[PDB]
Design a protein around this ligand. Sequence first.
Ligand code: MG
Lengths: 619, 205
Amino acid sequence: FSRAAMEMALRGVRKVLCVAEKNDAAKGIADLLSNGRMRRREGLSKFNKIYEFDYHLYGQNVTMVMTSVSGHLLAHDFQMQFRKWQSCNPLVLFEAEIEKYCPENFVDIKKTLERETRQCQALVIWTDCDREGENIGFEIIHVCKAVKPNLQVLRARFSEITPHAVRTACENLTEPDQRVSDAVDVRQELDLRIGAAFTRFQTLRLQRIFPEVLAEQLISYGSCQFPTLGFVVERFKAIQAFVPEIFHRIKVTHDHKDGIVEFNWKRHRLFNHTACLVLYQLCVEDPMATVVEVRSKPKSKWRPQALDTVELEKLASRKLRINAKETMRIAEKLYTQGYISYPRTETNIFPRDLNLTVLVEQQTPDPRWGAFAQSILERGGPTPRNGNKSDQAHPPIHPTKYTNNLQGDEQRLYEFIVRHFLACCSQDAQGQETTVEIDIAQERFVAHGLMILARNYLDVYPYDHWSDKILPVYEQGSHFQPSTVEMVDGETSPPKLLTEADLIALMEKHGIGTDATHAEHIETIKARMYVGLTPDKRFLPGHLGMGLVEGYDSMGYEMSKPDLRAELEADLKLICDGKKDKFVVLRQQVQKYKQVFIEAVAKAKKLDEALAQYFGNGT
Amino acid sequence: NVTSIALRAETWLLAAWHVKVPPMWLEACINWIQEENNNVNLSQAQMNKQVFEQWLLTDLRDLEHPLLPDGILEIPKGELNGFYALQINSLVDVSQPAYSQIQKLRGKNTTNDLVTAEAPSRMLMLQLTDGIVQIQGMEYQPIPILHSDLPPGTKILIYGNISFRLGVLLLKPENVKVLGGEVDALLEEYAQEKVLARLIGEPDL
Ligand SMILES: [Mg+2]
């Protein structure tokens, strides 16, 4: 724990084995700690190199053997006996023994870690600082501890690949968190058991019932992919059920030299022709408008809140037209290359430790946003708009280093992250809101006006729009003739199909897809052809997607609801905090999903009946 | 012979609530109240109350006693003056969509239906009747005593100066008083669910 405890522990250490999540992270971390002085060496895997370099750890000169894995080193599955679909009843998969194993393509990596453990006295985990990263770290620990059971294991904690971050990580090594690793092992186990049991059950059944339609096709089930599909089918059904209604409104306009002023009815609209016709007839006879109230107050447009993964995934889709799967891929690439902080975080509060003044200063060489960044500094300094969330691990996603060498979507997302950061550190746009109330035959109409005085954050953030709506001068007490007095017709509009940002928003609201896993589940329902994208580009459910959701929902128990997965994900967060143990969560979640499975097997014919609506007869 | 009690009740009904009733209904009503409370000799105060309670529960359509003036529907625009104790057959909010209203009434949750990633005073339209002519009553100014859940057959006093157009009365709070009551025959057909279901084209109604 203490500096003296660490120095004592390090004594007699000559070689320190360091392991990163991917080779690019290993090359990057080794390059920064060594100042490019590192010496490249080859591992038993051609894509996972070894970078040896001399370094000073807790008062001990060591040789750092920096290598990497390629994501998860170990694969989870049932034993060979349960692996075959026709070898057991899907129901037994809720209790069937599960094992972890190293795949053939990763055996070269496992053997490199084992090889280096023999020449090394300590192990430092350099995997990304998230739940999966801690689980990968524990996969590396298990492999190395098989060689040296008394091996000293440490964990390097960092939120960016920058010289100061990686140097501080070496001065502040900690113990690997078994609690967060265990939550990953619990989720991995539940996903395999619920996934396998429900997939084998429906695929085998529906392949027998609809052979011409679903031949050799995989009807997969996921504890999270199912309520995700549920949101898409729920919205489609809402639109299908929606009844549009004709409404009527009195529109009063007044022509001015450089623009028509439209006064909006205070009654807004009426769903009755006679009710509006009567009020309109009163307006045609004596249409003389009188200025009742000319009111004005200061209006402000708020600068963006500090950026977290969800807001990045949603704004990149809405504003940049990059889908969440790609955003997270590019965001990880920019993180690995040292340009942004770790892009998997719930934090929207800038920690007090973090120097925002330097991060702003760093962006002043840019031709586009450089002048704005300087402007923040000239106006006293950065004043961030923080939220209310903090994971206590990472800061909000922000630019950590300046680059002008990016291209394509990589440039677009970096530019977005930089502009959002500067906008957040800036001031709110300040304007002046005005309103003019007119009376026509005791009926009140209102015209609105806006005059922006200081655009502020808007000058760096073009993704938000604020526009002046300048109204002509109306004196309180004035009388005038309106240009037109109309009785126009309207109709109520249904909701629209969900966009990816709309779907992420619903998932967030209901507590599913937590730990930045939204994209993975949206991608699975896309790939399995349960949902399809319209040209708009919104989510439209397919006949199999539709049939499955209304099949399970007709069984009584509301299975398309995200309540059960939200409870599962809630329990996983408890495991991480040490607020719950992994054995109670596993026993409880398995008993809960085994019950839902047993009820679904009993009413299996409901699935056939719901899909028969689309595929017709079948036996 | 209850004609002596009938005149006293008629005097009170008009004086206290501006309620006009036919003599035959009034005499039949008093006789029934006397049979119901057979053991006693009721006071005029108790008789007047019980007669009025029976009136509040009576369908004006079955009373055949005109109150509203002749050809009120024939005049395109005008003003109505005087006191009228009419009956609401049905009632609906025209400031809100009937689909939106029926959803809330049916208690179903449509929260996910209005979820997006992107960052109106009430007007009741009353179907009023004196039992012979049917007109409309509009919430011209907010009348808080009226609400959509008022039972079909509810008796209301319509008084003062009221401007009317195309068979619609432009009612202000100073022109409305709710007396109460209900009509069993109307509770069935013109329940708020049924009124709204008709406006969104739901069958078997
Ligand atoms: Mg990772």
